[PDB]
Ligand binder design. Structure first.
Ligand code: WW3
Ligand code: ZN
Length: 257
């Protein structure tokens, strides 16, 4: 099966999933000088005050914090979006070292990690139907740099020892994702894809310019997770990021400056 190992990583994915070589793949390098400011872009509206987390899951490629998406609660709207996108899960990608880990890059700069808040367009009724549409998902991407701790991340970090290995889950209620948001909602946006198989071309990407800082100790605990299941040979869950893909016929737009 696909993964991030020595034999099944991103450069192999195209054999099982040929849209890996498609026209709107993610992530990309954000060349900041060529992104154009679009005065028609609206402020992002992030309304997470009623978000209801339920569980955290090691899915073998990352960990997902899952939400109740059966009511109109945590939604994302505005920005470049038409309509209303509901939060279903968040997860991260990260490196073996602080100098790599992000999926998007900024002028070729890699960050230590990247948070993806995944939302689906309510017009399609559920997530599984949304991923089949060109405007089905909106993923809010947030860079992580290593410096001062993020206090609103620590609840996630501390539960990680309970989901060390693939398939493990733990109840995870009352987690407030507002504690993961940088001060500014300035962003870049472009049309792209899921960054893991099946690599579907269904995402409006919204990448915040301002990173969040997390501590070395916090990111070190991400790197103690395992890709393998319990009782299998230990493979640390590190470098679970896809490299930048060709921009092809795409423009990245900036909400600022
Ligand atoms: N890394 S990412 O945010 O682009 C992302 C978000 C969500 C994803 N969910 N993928 N699934 C795809 C198969 C269809 C339904 C199950 C979830 C995959 C990748
Ligand atoms: Zn992701």
């Amino acid at each position: 099966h696909w993964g991030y190992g020595k034999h099944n990583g991103p450069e192999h994915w195209h054999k099982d999933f040929p849209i890996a070589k498609g026209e709107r793949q993610s992530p990309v390098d954000i060349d900041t000088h060529t992104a154009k400011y679009d005065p028609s872009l609206k402020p992002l509206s992030v309304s997470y005050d009623q978000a209801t987390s339920l569980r955290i899951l090691n899915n073998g490629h990352a960990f997902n914090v899952e939400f109740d998406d059966s009511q109109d609660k945590a939604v994302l709207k505005g920005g470049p979006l038409d309509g209303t996108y509901r939060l279903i899960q968040f997860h991260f990608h990260w490196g073996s070292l602080d100098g790599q880990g992000s999926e998007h890059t900024v002028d070729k700069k890699k960050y230590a990690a990247e948070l993806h808040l995944v939302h689906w367009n309510t017009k399609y009724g559920d997530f599984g139907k949304a991923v089949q549409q060109p405007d089905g998902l909106a993923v809010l991407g947030i860079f992580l740099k290593v410096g001062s701790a993020k206090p609103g991340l620590q609840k996630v970090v501390d539960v990680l020892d309970s989901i060390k290995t693939k398939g493990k889950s733990a109840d995870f209620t009352n987690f407030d994702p507002r504690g993961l948001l940088p001060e500014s909602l300035d962003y870049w946006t472009y049309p792209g894809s899921l960054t893991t198989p099946p690599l579907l071309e269904c995402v409006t990407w919204i990448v915040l310019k301002e990173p969040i800082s997390v501590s070395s100790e916090q990111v070190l605990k991400f790197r103690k997770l395992n890709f393998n299941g319990e009782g299998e040979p230990e493979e640390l869950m590190v470098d679970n990021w896809r490299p930048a893909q060709p921009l092809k016929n795409r423009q990245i737009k900036a909400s600022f400056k």
